[PDB]
């Protein structure tokens, strides 16, 4: 029941590493899942469908963690505390490097997609802005920018660059310096006048 | 000759304001170039070939104009510097919403319109890190991060930030605060320690 689900996920997020979506049959996805056409319409209405909910539980793992996170603080200063924030994104989306090409992609296409990005980066925005205003309270950072436009723009980098990175794009931060890169440009903009 | 070309140039940014690509049939260029199918076909080769060369002399615009300022020191501070450039891609790309919109979803599809991207985002932090790594020279700036990866990063949320912007997508800095909020972290990123 589950177990055929799963199978389906798995073999799509695998077919993923070596070619995009269009060049993907629902075909292809029932055979390595060992099942039927037929049988693999029960369990999605599409190959689309299928990475809508690859999507969901990456962008819900890094949440999730992102939350873990939120609840037990870091004894660390300014600088570990963002790194450990970030880090918490490049983890997890680059540990699922295929569905994250793919879902950015769908975006154009998938308006589930759209959505489903939308939702969470605004609630990642939130919780920057939260934590910005939080350190702007303790007086540890100056009261600059709107922190929620602050919170927006980083996001976006953070967005762009991270995937421009992992996609091996050109150009692109080298995904082994993008940590360091992004961690610099948070903490000089959100502590510095 | 020329005419019908730039007509059918014109017609496509037109019709991309209202709709997209998909939406827009080469039909519905002819008409409104008023020329007939075949006549279009003589000019282009398709209307993702019309949106190409669209996004080619926007970009060439924003490259010229960024080109113009660099001939041509402004006798101001490094704030304003930053700011002076930044402000030709937010008007020239915010002059052009459309066929920026347009341009952007056809780098998943077209390689030409990648290509095009591509070669002048490096060109474009190329030239960043240039000004970064002089502004160091001459002790302005300090030796933090490689300045080619902070001109990536950099040159990568201006991109996300600007068009997020530009679409109105959610989320986004609001158009009429994008400028400040980049320049912003341009400067804090490029200055501070
Ligand atoms: C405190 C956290 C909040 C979120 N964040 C971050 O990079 N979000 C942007 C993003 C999502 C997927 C790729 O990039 C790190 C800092
Ligand atoms: C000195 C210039 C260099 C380029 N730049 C910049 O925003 N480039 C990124 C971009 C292109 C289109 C949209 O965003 C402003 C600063």
Redesign the pocket.
Known sequence: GDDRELAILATAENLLEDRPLADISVDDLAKGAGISRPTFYFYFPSKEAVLLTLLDRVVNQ?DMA?QTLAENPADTDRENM?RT??N???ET?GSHKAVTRAGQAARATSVEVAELWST??QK??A??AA?IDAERDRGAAPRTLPAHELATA??????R???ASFAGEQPSVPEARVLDT?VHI?VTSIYGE
Do not use: K
């Not at 980083?154 to 967005?159: C, D, I, K």
């Open positions: 890094a992102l963002w924030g970030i918490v994104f490049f989306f969470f980066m990642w925005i919780y920057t934590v980083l996001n976006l980098m953070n967005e660059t991270l995937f992004l948070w």
